[PDB]
Tab-separated table of C-alpha atoms and ligand atoms in Angstrom:
chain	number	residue	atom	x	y	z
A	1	UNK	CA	201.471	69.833	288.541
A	2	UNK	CA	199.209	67.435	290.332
A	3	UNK	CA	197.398	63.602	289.795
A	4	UNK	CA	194.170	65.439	291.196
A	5	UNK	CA	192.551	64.551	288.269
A	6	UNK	CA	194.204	61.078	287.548
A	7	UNK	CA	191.550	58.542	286.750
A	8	UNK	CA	191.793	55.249	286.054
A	9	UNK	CA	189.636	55.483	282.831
A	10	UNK	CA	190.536	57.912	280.339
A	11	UNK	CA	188.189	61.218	280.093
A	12	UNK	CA	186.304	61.995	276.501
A	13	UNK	CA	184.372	65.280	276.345
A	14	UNK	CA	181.516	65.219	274.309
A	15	UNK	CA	180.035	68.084	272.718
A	16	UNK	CA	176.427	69.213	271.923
A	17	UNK	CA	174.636	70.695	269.105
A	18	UNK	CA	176.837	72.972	266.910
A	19	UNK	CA	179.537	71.616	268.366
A	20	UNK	CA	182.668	70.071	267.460
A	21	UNK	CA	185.818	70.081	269.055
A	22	UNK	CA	187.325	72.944	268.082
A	23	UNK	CA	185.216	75.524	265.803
A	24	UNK	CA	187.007	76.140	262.804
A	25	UNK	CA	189.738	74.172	264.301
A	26	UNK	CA	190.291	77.414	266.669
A	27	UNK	CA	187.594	77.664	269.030
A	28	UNK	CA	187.603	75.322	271.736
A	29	UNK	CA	184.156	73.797	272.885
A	30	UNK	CA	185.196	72.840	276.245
A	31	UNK	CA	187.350	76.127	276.623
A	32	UNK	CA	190.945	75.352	278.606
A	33	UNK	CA	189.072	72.173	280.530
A	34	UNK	CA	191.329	69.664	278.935
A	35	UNK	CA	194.344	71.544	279.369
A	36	UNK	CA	192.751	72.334	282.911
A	37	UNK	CA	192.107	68.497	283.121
A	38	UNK	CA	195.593	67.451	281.739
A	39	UNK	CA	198.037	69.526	284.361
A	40	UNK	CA	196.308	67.975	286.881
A	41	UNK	CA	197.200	64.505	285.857
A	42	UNK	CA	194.143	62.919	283.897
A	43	UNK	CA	194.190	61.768	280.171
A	44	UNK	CA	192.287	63.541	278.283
A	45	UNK	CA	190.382	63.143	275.090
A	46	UNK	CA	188.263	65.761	273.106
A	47	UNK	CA	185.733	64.393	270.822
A	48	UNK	CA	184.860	65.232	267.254
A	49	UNK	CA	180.965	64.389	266.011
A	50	UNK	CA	178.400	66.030	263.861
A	51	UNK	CA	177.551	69.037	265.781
A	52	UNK	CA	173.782	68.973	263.613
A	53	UNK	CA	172.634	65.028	263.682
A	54	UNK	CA	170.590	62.909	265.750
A	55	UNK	CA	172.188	60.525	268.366
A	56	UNK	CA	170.870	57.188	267.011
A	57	UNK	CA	170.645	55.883	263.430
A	58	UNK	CA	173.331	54.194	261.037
A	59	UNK	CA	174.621	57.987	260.267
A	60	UNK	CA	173.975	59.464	263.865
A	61	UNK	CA	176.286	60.918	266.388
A	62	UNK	CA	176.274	57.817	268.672
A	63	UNK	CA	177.559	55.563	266.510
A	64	UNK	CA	180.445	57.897	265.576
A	65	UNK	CA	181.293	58.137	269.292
A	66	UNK	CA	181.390	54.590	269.771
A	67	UNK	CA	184.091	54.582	266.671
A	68	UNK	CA	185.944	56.697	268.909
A	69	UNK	CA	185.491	55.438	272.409
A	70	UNK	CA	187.413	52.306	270.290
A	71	UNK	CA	190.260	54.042	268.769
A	72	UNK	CA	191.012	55.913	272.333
A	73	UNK	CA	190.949	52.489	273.733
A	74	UNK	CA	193.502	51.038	271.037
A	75	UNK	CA	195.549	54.121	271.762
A	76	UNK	CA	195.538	53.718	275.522
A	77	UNK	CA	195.538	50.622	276.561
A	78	UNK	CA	192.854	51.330	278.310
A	79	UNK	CA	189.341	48.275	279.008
A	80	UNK	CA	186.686	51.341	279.621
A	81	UNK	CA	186.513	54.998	279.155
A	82	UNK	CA	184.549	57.874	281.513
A	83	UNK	CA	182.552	59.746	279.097
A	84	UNK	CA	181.907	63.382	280.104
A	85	UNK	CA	179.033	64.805	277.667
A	86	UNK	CA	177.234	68.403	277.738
A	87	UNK	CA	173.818	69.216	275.753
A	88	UNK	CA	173.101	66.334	273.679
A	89	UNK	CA	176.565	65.098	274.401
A	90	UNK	CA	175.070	63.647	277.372
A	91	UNK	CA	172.074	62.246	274.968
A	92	UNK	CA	175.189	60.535	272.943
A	93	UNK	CA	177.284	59.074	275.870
A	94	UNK	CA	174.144	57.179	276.840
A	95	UNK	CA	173.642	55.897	273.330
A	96	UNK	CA	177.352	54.234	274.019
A	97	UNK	CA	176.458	53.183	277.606
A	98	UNK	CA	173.286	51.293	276.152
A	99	UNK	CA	175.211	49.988	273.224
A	100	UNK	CA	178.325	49.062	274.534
A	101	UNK	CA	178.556	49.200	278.552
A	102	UNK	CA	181.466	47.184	278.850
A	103	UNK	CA	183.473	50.030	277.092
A	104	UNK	CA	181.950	52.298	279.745
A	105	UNK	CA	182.966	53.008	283.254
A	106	UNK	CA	180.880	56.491	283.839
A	107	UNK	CA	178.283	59.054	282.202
A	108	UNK	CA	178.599	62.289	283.214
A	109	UNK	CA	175.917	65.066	282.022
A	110	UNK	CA	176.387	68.895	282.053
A	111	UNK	CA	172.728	70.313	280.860
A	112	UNK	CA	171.440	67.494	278.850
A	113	UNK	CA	168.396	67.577	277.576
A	114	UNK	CA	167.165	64.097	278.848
A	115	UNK	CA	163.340	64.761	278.530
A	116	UNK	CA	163.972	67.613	275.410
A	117	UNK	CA	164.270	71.093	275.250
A	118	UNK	CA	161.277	73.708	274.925
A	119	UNK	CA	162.739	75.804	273.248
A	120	UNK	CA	163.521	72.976	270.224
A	121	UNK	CA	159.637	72.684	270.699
A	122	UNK	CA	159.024	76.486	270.078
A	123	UNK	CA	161.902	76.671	266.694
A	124	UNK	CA	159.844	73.778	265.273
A	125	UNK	CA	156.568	75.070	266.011
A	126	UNK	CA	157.717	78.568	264.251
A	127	UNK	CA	159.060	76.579	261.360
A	128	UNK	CA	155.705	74.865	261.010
A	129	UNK	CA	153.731	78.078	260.553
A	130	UNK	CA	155.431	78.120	256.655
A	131	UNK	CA	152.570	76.550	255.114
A	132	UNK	CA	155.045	75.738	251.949
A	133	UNK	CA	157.256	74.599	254.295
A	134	UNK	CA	160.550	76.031	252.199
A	135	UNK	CA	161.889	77.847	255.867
A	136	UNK	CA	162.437	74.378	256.784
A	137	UNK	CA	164.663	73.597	253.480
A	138	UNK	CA	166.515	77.108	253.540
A	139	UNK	CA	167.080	77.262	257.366
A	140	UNK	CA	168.385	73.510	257.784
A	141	UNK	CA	170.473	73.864	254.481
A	142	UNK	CA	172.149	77.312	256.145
A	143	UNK	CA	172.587	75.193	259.509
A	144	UNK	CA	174.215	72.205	257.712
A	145	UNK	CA	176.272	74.346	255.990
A	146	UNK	CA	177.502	76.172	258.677
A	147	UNK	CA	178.432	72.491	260.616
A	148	UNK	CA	180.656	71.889	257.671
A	149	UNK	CA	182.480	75.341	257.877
A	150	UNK	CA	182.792	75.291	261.373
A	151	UNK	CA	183.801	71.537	261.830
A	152	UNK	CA	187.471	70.783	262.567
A	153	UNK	CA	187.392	68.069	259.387
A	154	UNK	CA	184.887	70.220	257.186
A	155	UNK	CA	182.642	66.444	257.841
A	156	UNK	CA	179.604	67.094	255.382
A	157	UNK	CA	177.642	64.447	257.823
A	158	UNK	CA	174.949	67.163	259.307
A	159	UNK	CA	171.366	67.040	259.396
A	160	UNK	CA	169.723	70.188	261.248
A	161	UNK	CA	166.275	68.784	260.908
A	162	UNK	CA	167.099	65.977	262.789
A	163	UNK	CA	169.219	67.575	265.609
A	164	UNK	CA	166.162	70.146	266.564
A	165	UNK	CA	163.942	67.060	266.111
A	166	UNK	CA	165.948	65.056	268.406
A	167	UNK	CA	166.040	67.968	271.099
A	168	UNK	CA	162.447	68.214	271.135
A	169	UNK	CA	160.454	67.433	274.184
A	170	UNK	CA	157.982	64.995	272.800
A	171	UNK	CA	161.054	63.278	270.979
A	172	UNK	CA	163.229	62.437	273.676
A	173	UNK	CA	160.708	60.722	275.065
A	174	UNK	CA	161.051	58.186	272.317
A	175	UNK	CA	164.466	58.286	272.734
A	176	UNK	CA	164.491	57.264	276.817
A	177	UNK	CA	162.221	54.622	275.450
A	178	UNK	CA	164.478	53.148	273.157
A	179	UNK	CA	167.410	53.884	275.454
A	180	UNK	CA	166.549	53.253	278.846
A	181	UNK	CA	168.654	54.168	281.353
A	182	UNK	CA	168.474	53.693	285.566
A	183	UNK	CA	169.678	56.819	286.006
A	184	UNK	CA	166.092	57.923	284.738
A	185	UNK	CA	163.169	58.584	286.715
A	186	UNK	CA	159.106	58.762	285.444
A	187	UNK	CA	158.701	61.094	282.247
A	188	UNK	CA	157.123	64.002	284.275
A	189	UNK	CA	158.526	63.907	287.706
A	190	UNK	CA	160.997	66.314	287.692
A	191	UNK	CA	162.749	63.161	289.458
A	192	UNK	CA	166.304	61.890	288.875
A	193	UNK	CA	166.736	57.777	288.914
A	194	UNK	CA	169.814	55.265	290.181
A	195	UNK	CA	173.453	56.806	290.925
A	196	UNK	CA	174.530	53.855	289.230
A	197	UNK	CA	173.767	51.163	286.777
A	198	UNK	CA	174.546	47.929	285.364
A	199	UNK	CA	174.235	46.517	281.664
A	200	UNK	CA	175.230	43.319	280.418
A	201	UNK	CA	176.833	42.434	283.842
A	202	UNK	CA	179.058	46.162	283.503
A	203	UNK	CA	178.797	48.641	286.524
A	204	UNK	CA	178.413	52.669	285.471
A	205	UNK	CA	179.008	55.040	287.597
A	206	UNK	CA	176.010	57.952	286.661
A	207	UNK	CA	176.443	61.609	287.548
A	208	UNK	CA	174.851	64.800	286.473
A	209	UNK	CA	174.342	68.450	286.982
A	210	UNK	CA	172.569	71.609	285.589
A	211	UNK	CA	173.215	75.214	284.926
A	212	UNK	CA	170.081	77.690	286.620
A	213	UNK	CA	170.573	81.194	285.449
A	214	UNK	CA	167.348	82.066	284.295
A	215	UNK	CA	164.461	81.313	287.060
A	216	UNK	CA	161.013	82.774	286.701
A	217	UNK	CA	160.346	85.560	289.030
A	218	UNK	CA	157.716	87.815	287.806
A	219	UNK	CA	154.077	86.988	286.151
A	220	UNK	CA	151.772	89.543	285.099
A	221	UNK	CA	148.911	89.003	282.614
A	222	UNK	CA	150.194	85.464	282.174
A	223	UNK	CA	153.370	86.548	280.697
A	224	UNK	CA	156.052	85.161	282.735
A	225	UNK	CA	159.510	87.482	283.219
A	226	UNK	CA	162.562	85.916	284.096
A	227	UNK	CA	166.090	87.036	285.868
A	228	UNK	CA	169.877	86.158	284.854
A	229	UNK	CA	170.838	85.009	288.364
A	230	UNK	CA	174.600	84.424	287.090
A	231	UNK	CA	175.019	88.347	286.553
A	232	UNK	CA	174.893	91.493	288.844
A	233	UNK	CA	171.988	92.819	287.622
A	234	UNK	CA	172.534	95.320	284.899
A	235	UNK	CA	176.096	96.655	285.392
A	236	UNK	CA	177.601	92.790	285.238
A	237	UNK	CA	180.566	92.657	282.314
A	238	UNK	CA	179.471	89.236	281.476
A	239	UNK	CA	176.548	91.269	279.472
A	240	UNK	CA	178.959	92.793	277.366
A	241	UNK	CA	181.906	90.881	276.957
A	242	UNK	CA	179.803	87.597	275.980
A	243	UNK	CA	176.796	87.881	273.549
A	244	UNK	CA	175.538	84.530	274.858
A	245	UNK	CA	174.714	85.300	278.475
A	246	UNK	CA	172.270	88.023	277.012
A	247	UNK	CA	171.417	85.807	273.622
A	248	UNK	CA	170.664	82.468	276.726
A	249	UNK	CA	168.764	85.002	278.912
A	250	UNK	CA	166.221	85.791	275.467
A	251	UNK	CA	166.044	81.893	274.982
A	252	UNK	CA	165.507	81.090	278.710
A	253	UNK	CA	162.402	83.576	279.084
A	254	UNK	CA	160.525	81.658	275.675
A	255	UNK	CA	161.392	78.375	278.131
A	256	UNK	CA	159.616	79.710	281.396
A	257	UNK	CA	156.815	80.683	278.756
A	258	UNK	CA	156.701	77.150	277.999
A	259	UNK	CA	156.409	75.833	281.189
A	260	UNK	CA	160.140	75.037	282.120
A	261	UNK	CA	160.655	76.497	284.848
A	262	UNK	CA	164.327	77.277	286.100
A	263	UNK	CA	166.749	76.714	283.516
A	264	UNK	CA	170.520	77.620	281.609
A	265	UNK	CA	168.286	79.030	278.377
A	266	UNK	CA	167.737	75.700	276.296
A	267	UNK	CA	167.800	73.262	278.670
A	268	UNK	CA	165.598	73.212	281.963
A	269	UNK	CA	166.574	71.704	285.208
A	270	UNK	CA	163.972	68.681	285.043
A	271	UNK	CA	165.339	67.509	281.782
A	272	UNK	CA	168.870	67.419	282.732
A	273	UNK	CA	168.259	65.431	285.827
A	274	UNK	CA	170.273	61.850	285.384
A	275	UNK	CA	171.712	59.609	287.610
A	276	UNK	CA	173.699	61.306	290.699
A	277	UNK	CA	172.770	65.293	290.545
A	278	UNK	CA	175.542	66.462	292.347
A	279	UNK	CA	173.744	70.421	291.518
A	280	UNK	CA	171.553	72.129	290.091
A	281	UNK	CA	171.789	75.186	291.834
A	282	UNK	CA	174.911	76.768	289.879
A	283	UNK	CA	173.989	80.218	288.493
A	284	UNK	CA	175.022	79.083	284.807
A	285	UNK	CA	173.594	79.684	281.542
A	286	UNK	CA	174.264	77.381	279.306
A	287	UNK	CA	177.878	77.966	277.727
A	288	UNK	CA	178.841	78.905	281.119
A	289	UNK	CA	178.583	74.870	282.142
A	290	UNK	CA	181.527	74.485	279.286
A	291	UNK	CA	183.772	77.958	280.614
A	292	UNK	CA	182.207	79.456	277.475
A	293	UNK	CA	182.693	81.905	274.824
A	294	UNK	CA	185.966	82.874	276.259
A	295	UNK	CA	185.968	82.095	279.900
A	296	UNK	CA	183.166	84.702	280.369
A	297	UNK	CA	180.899	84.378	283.212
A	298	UNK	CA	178.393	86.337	285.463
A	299	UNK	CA	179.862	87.312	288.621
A	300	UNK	CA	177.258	84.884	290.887
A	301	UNK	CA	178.828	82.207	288.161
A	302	UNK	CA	180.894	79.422	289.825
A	303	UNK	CA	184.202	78.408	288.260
A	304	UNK	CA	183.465	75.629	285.430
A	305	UNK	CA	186.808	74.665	285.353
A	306	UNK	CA	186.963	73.848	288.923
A	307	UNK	CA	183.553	71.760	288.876
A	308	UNK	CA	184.793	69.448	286.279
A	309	UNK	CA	188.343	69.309	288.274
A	310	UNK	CA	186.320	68.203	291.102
A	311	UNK	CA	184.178	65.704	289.550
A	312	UNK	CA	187.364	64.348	287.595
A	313	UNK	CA	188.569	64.368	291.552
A	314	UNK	CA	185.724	62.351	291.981
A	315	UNK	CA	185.930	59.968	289.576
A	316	UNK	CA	189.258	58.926	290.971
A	317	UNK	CA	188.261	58.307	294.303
A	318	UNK	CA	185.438	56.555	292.985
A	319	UNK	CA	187.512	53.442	291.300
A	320	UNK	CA	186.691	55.096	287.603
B	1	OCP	P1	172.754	71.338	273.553
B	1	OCP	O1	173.342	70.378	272.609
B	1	OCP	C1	171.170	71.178	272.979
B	1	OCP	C2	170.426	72.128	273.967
B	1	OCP	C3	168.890	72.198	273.384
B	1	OCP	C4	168.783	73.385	272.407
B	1	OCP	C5	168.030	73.480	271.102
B	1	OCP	C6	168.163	74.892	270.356
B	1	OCP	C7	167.260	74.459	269.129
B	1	OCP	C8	168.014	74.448	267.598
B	1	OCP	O2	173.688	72.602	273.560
B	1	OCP	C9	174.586	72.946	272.429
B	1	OCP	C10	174.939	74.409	272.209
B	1	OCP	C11	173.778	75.449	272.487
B	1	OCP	O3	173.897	76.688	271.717
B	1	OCP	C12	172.885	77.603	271.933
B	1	OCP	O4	171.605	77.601	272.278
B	1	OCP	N1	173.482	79.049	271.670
B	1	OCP	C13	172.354	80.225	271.993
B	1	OCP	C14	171.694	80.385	270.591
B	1	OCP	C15	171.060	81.658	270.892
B	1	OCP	C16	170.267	82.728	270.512
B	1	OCP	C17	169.085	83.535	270.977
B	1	OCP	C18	168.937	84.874	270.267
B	1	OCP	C19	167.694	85.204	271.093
B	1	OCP	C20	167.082	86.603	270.751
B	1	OCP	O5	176.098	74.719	273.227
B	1	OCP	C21	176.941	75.426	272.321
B	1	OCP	O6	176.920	75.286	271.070
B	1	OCP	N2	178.203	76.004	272.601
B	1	OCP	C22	179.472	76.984	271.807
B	1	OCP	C23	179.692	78.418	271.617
B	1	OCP	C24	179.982	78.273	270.237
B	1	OCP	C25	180.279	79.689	269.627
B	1	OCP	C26	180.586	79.323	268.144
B	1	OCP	C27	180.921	80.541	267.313
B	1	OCP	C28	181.198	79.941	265.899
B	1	OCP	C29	181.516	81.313	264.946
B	2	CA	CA1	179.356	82.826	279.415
């Protein structure tokens, strides 16, 4: 009905781990935000990657967005695109930023992982305690497999290993090494860098935001105990209705046990600091940051749909 969302550049969504962009080609990742995105004027474009890779390397997931940042181009018209990632999508948009700026007008992150993940620490560290090391083979090959049955094109290119490698804290901080970015700030700050940034003589327009459900608010006896500040405690639908608001709150209280603080359940808020952090305070989990598993939310939970409309708002008004 509206050019709300009009931007100059067209939009491309990129997924995280798992994803794709549709799950068995039914599922929507970024549930009714391109539709969302698309009455209000904007072009839209979804993309489709390994959901289990890393983001560099011949094979990775960067180098297949790239291929498609190109082919939207050559179907557009278009100089630039605004790329819009969540999870590691936000870990692959940057790879294209770095790579190729002048194909890049804006990076947008929704709960990256920019420093790692804890709890990618903690799955590693349990898979490490198989002294034949044959969870690692089993596990990875049930992963993969489940990438290629769950892809949109069935792509076979999915290495499990590598995505919870890539996701780890210690790893990242290769990969901000060998991907610098000014919308970075110290490893260990729990600082955010430059709103924007310029490569190769190419302006980018950096933004970012994170989901804080889970924030520590009891320790006893060293064990830390967490709340789901998205939910009304206990009686909240969103419990029922959506087995990842419960399944997120589990993974957020290992995180605060690792030393994360307040997080969405994988990700915590230091590590998906980049660029402009418009929030940080939503009470999100982490599918809730992509109107996840079927538009569920907690009822402190503020409308996904509308935060991306904004920030697509936003991009307009900022020349992208
Ligand atoms: P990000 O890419 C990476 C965040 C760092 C996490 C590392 C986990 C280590 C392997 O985000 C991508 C995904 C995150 O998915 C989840 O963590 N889901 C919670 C798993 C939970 C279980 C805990 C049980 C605890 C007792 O974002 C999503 O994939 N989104 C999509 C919903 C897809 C539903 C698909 C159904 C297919 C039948
Ligand atoms: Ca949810």
């Amino acid at each position: 009905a509206d050019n709300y969302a009009a931007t100059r550049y067209p939009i491309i969504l990129v997924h995280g781990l798992t994803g794709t962009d549709k799950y068995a080609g039914v599922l929507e990742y970024w549930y009714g935000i391109q539709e969302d995105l698309q009455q209000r004027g904007a072009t839209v474009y979804v993309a489709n990657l390994s959901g289990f890779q890393s983001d560099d390397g011949p094979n990775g997931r960067g180098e297949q967005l790239l291929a498609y940042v190109k082919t939207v181009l050559a179907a557009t018209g278009a100089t630039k695109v605004n790329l819009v990632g969540h999870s590691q999508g936000g870990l692959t948009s940057r790879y294209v930023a770095a790579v190729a700026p002048d194909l890049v007008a804006s990076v947008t992150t929704i709960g990256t992982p920019h420093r790692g993940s804890e709890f990618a620490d903690f799955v590693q560290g349990v898979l490490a305690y198989d002294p034949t090391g044959l969870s690692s083979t089993v596990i990875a090959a049930f992963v993969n497999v489940f990438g290629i049955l769950t892809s949109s094109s069935n792509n076979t290119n999915q290495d499990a290993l590598a995505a919870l490698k890539t996701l780890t804290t210690a790893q990242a901080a290769t990969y901000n090494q060998n991907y610098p970015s000014a919308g970075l700030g110290a490893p260990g700050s729990c600082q955010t860098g430059a709103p924007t940034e310029t490569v190769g003589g190419n302006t980018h327009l950096l933004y970012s935001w994170a989901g804080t459900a889970i924030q520590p608010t009891i320790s006893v006896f060293g064990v830390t105990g967490a709340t789901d500040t998205s939910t009304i405690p206990l009686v909240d639908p969103a419990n029922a209705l959506d087995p990842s608001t419960l399944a997120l709150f589990g993974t957020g209280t290992v995180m605060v046990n690792r030393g994360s603080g307040q997080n969405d359940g994988v990700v915590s808020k230091c590590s998906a600091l980049y660029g402009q952090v418009l929030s940080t305070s939503y009470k999100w989990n982490h599918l809730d940051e992509i109107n996840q598993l079927l538009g569920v939310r907690g009822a402190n939970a503020e409308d996904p749909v509308a935060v991306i409309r904004t920030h697509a708002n936003r991009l307009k008004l900022a020349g992208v």
